[PDB]
Design an enzyme around this catalytic site. Sequence first.
Site, PDB file in Angstrom:
ATOM      1  N   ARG A   1       0.872  -1.184   0.000  1.00  0.00           N
ATOM      2  CA  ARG A   1       0.000   0.000   0.000  1.00  0.00           C
ATOM      3  C   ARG A   1       0.905   1.229   0.000  1.00  0.00           C
ATOM      4  O   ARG A   1       1.896   1.261   0.740  1.00  0.00           O
ATOM      5  CB  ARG A   1      -0.903   0.056   1.250  1.00  0.00           C
TER       6      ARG A   1
ATOM      7  N   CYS B   1       4.153  -5.724  14.528  1.00  0.00           N
ATOM      8  CA  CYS B   1       4.080  -5.829  15.988  1.00  0.00           C
ATOM      9  C   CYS B   1       3.365  -7.075  16.475  1.00  0.00           C
ATOM     10  O   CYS B   1       3.098  -7.222  17.655  1.00  0.00           O
ATOM     11  CB  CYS B   1       3.451  -4.545  16.551  1.00  0.00           C
TER      12      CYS B   1
ATOM     13  N   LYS C   1      -8.537  -3.959   3.379  1.00  0.00           N
ATOM     14  CA  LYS C   1      -8.399  -2.721   4.178  1.00  0.00           C
ATOM     15  C   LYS C   1      -9.367  -1.607   3.749  1.00  0.00           C
ATOM     16  O   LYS C   1      -9.934  -0.875   4.603  1.00  0.00           O
ATOM     17  CB  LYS C   1      -6.982  -2.169   4.100  1.00  0.00           C
TER      18      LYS C   1
ATOM     19  N   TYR D   1      -1.622  -5.263  -5.998  1.00  0.00           N
ATOM     20  CA  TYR D   1      -1.092  -5.854  -4.772  1.00  0.00           C
ATOM     21  C   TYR D   1      -1.959  -5.621  -3.531  1.00  0.00           C
ATOM     22  O   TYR D   1      -2.394  -4.509  -3.278  1.00  0.00           O
ATOM     23  CB  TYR D   1       0.285  -5.262  -4.499  1.00  0.00           C
TER      24      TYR D   1
ATOM     25  N   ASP E   1      -6.620  -9.949  12.118  1.00  0.00           N
ATOM     26  CA  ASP E   1      -6.373  -8.609  11.507  1.00  0.00           C
ATOM     27  C   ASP E   1      -7.489  -7.569  11.619  1.00  0.00           C
ATOM     28  O   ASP E   1      -7.210  -6.402  11.885  1.00  0.00           O
ATOM     29  CB  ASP E   1      -5.991  -8.775  10.033  1.00  0.00           C
TER      30      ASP E   1
ATOM     31  N   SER F   1       1.178  -3.011  12.002  1.00  0.00           N
ATOM     32  CA  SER F   1       2.050  -3.873  11.228  1.00  0.00           C
ATOM     33  C   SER F   1       3.430  -4.016  11.917  1.00  0.00           C
ATOM     34  O   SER F   1       3.929  -3.076  12.540  1.00  0.00           O
ATOM     35  CB  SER F   1       2.193  -3.333   9.797  1.00  0.00           C
TER      36      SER F   1
ATOM     37  N   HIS G   1      -8.592  -2.509  13.499  1.00  0.00           N
ATOM     38  CA  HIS G   1      -7.423  -3.273  13.094  1.00  0.00           C
ATOM     39  C   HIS G   1      -7.000  -4.156  14.259  1.00  0.00           C
ATOM     40  O   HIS G   1      -5.980  -3.907  14.904  1.00  0.00           O
ATOM     41  CB  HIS G   1      -6.323  -2.282  12.706  1.00  0.00           C
TER      42      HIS G   1
ATOM     43  N   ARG H   1       3.889 -11.847   1.718  1.00  0.00           N
ATOM     44  CA  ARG H   1       2.681 -12.384   2.323  1.00  0.00           C
ATOM     45  C   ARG H   1       2.354 -13.796   1.896  1.00  0.00           C
ATOM     46  O   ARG H   1       2.730 -14.232   0.791  1.00  0.00           O
ATOM     47  CB  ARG H   1       1.456 -11.510   1.963  1.00  0.00           C
TER      48      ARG H   1
END
Length: 619
Positions: free
Chosen positions: A85, A286, A242, A233, A309, A284, A262, A403
Amino acid sequence: PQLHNGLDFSAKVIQGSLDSLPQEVRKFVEGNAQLCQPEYIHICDGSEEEYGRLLAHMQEEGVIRKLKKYDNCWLALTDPRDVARIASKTVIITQEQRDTVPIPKSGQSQLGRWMSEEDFEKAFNARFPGCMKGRTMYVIPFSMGPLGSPLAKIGIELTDSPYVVASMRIMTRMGTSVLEALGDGEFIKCLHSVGCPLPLKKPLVNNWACNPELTLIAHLPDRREIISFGSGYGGNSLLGKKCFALRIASRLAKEEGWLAEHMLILGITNPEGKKKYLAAAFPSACGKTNLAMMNPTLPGWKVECVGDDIAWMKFDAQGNLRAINPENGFFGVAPGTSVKTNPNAIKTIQKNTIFTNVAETSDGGVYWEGIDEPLAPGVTITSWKNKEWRPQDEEPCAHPNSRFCTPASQCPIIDPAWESPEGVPIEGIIFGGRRPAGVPLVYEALSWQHGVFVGAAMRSEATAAEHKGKVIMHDPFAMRPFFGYNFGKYLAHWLSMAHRPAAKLPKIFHVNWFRKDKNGKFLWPGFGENSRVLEWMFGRIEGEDSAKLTPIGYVPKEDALNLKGLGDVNVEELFGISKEFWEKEVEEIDKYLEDQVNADLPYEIERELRALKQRISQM
Ligand SMILES: Nc1nc2c(ncn2[C@@H]2O[C@H](COP(=O)(O)OP(=O)(O)OP(=O)(O)O)[C@@H](O)[C@H]2O)c(=O)[nH]1
Ligand SMILES: [Mn+2]
Ligand SMILES: [Mn+2]
Ligand SMILES: [Mn+2]
Ligand code: NA
């Protein structure tokens, strides 16, 4: 009913029937077929046959490779220009800028990016007309959440990318049953193009269609639309992931009285068989996915995964905060994933999985940094750039945010209620991120309002296209990339949950797995050892006298945490709270909230900031 055969695209349908679509679904498909000029229209049914052929076709074209070591696993390598992104090209369109972001006193907002209707119309006209020439427009009917759940929402995604179709099948519920469930009800309109009409104007890199120069991911909440151009992507192309899941959904949630966040959702069971559900918002890098599928080190404890997520949460009539996972799979960061750091991910991804931008071993396996599986002597590695790669090279073998895309049903510790239509009752919300200094392993907020402040104040050491190296930045609620509307109003929405009669407000905690000593070494071993911290939260929700009050909130008492097996743990430093550190922290939070939120900051947040300052002053 017409003078020619113009607006009827029946002749170009190669699967399904335009007659079988709901009226408004048809208008959306045919309007965009007229605009984008695809060669064919493929109405997706979601079937196993559809999928296999679609994969085989992408294989037949060199878009994906089959990973021969595993059961039905596939690799896609992208153009390196299209690998995440892009925040600067991700925009929300509203009449007024302030409804989308607060107006910053200096520089840009860090909390979103607005584009005017006028600017967006110009951008759209410069991109979409003719953009699907020579390609198939796939029509993807999908549900975010279990089909028929009152918490679920339906979208229709039009895309020219079969990679998107394959991945959306994994990450959402899609096909004919969704169209059946939808009827004439409302839906989110999701329009996607890779922006490479045929014949190609520019050379194709790595058989991966994209238009980096014109990449633009737009959200029009007032129109119930997502319009994305030029990237193939991830969150730019899988428009559920998202764009719908957080950006559009948080605005709907604001309107309709729920929350789109999130957050992972896990179920934890103690040795006595008592079970609770916890949601956790970390940024992200973490470790949501690690926590959500934890293999707990503590004997007799069990963790089950509901989602890794996104959480959609709404108070039920009894006052339970009910959470669903609106996704159907895990779109997980591959690097760092191992038997050590995430054994349950490893078991999920061995079949029916699509990997993107990871390395390939000479025996057709997957490889990435931190996989913690040594190879047999002789096995070589092909990088995500399609080149041979040796361990001592400068470049990594896998893209750092590469991913896997794997069905949720395949997780061996998937919660048996992960698709339950009412959702699971959340008793704790956990915030956290990477703080190398100052912030202890775990604390508990003093109240709902304090807890909202703790979410608002979150900072985390983040790690490439926006800055070099690691840097501590604000990421309130782990939502900085994802707010659908003005952050100050988002805080107000969170605070309002306290005024719902009979609400059973979850206890709020903040964690830090990443605190380090003077020499840069981690004070806490983490991963499955985080079960010890979950144990304490569990007991705290039960009202156990296991907490010591501090200026930042409640921390575990001396000896409250089970540290059996962990005798080298410097608890003094790991739980230490310094007045100097926290004076600096509140000053920095004050400045950030003033600069970035200002006139939209709720009173209650300002009061919590004053209160924390006051408690620190008395140290
Ligand atoms: N030291 C330490 N690192 C951890 C722990 N849990 C996870 N990590 C690290 O966190 C990273 C993996 O996190 P990600 O999968 O990017 O996090 P995520 O929250 O799932 O991110 P998104 O999928 O992008 O939402 C790796 O660097 C892991 O080593 C822990 O308990 N301790
Ligand atoms: Mn071909
Ligand atoms: Mn994840
Ligand atoms: Mn995420
Ligand atoms: Na490729």
